[PDB]
Amino acid sequence: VSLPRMVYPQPKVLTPCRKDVLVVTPWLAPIVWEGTFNIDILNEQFRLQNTTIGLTVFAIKKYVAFLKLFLETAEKHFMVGHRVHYYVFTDQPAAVPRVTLGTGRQLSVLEVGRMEMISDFCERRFLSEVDYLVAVDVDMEFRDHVGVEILTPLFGTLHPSFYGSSREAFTYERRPQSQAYIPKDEGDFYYMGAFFGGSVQEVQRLTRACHQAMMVDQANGIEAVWHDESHLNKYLLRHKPTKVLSPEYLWDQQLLGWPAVLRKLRFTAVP
């Protein structure tokens, strides 16, 4: 379906987008930084498709306390204008705060007794209800725009502690006995487990692969150094993401401040 007439600044072929950061991977996936995208064009493209975005979040034991701020700030900043379906996985349904949602946005509480829950228990439901799935940690708040610029078949996010690091310095799983093993001469980026996503199909593929690999590891009596993040990094090494999010999308201002390369701090650790 065709875009309408739109008036915006002409793109400049002979002006680099950013001169301080890498804005495309070697497999031609965009790295999403402020300045790289026109949100009006992207909003049009995804609205024309009636895009629904599922956000999955696990809130277990004491973590239920982070829900009110997480959801309230998501309402202000996450996919505003688009259909959103929050999926809150919790051991305490009654402790889920009653947060007021904007039109076209809904929340489902799913009681638990992450990779098995997305791939196994919820597969049919997600294919039916949403176009994209995003998995994030609950102990976080949105502080600025997180929108459809992220949407793509499969994305990972640059871990804020490692985005300038050498691949040798990445905390990948280094034991050859683990399915998550990555040697010191391999690796593109260190992706944080706290923010990944993509189409429902690609996210189920990923969570199925991870879950199967983790069970192998367990049967072999080994546990990856950083658990499902270790597995996520292996998967994204072998199945390149179609977009990568800059650390604007997963930051910790207390730990890391507000450096020059970040024009916006969008989604952050709660102290």
Binding pattern for the stretch 149-178 against its own copies, x by CB under 8 A and - elsewhere? x--------x----xx-xx-----------
Is 63 annotated as ligand-binding? yes
Is 252 annotated as ligand-binding? yes
Asked if 235 touches Hg ion (CB under 5 A), the answer is: yes
Site for Hg ion in 205-234 (CB under 5 A): 209-210, 213, 228, 231-232
- From residue 103, give the alpha-carbon distance in Å to each of 48, 75, 84, 97, 241: 18, 10, 9, 18, 31
Q: Given the DSSP bridges, would you call strands 140-142 and 105-111 parallel, antiparallel or unpaired?
A: unpaired
Selection from its own copies, Hg ion, none that 31 binds (CB < 5 to 8 A by kind) is its own copies
Instruction: Classify the C-alpha dihedral 58-62-65-69 as positive or negative.
Output: negative
Asked if 21 touches its own copies (CB under 8 A), the answer is: yes
Q: Quickly count: other Cβ atoms within 10 Å of residue 23's Cβ.
A: 17
The Cα 119–Cα 96 span in angstroms is: 23
Judged by beta carbon, residue 56 or residue 242, the one nearer its own copies is: 242
> Which ranges constitute the DSSP H helices of 4-145?
39-48, 67-77, 115-116, 123-129
Q: Which two tokens stand for residue 154?
A: 């499969």
Is 137 annotated as ligand-binding? yes
Counting residues that bind Hg ion (by CB under 5 A) gives: 9
Which one-letter amino acid corresponds to residue 266? R
The residues annotated as belonging to the active site are: 229
Q: Which of 32, 57, 136, 250 binds its own copies (CB under 8 A)?
A: 32
Q: Residue 32: phi, psi to the nearest 5? A: -85, 105
Is 185 annotated as ligand-binding? no
Closest-CA residue to 247 (of 135, 134, 132, 146): 146
The Cα 181–Cα 226 span in angstroms is: 11
Judged by beta carbon, residue 36 or residue 45, the one nearer Hg ion is: 36
Judged by beta carbon, residue 75 or residue 188, the one nearer its own copies is: 188
Asked if 258 touches its own copies (CB under 8 A), the answer is: no
Buried b (16+ CB within 10 A) or exposed e, 243-257: bbbbbbbbbbeeeee
Asked if 7 touches its own copies (CB under 8 A), the answer is: yes
Residues annotated within the binding site are: 58-60, 63, 137-139, 159, 171, 229, 252
The binding site for Hg ion (CB under 5 A) comprises: 17, 35, 209-210, 213, 228, 231-232, 235
The binding site for its own copies (CB under 8 A) comprises: 2-3, 5-8, 10-32, 36-38, 41-42, 45, 149, 158, 163-164, 166-167, 183, 185-189, 237-240, 243, 261
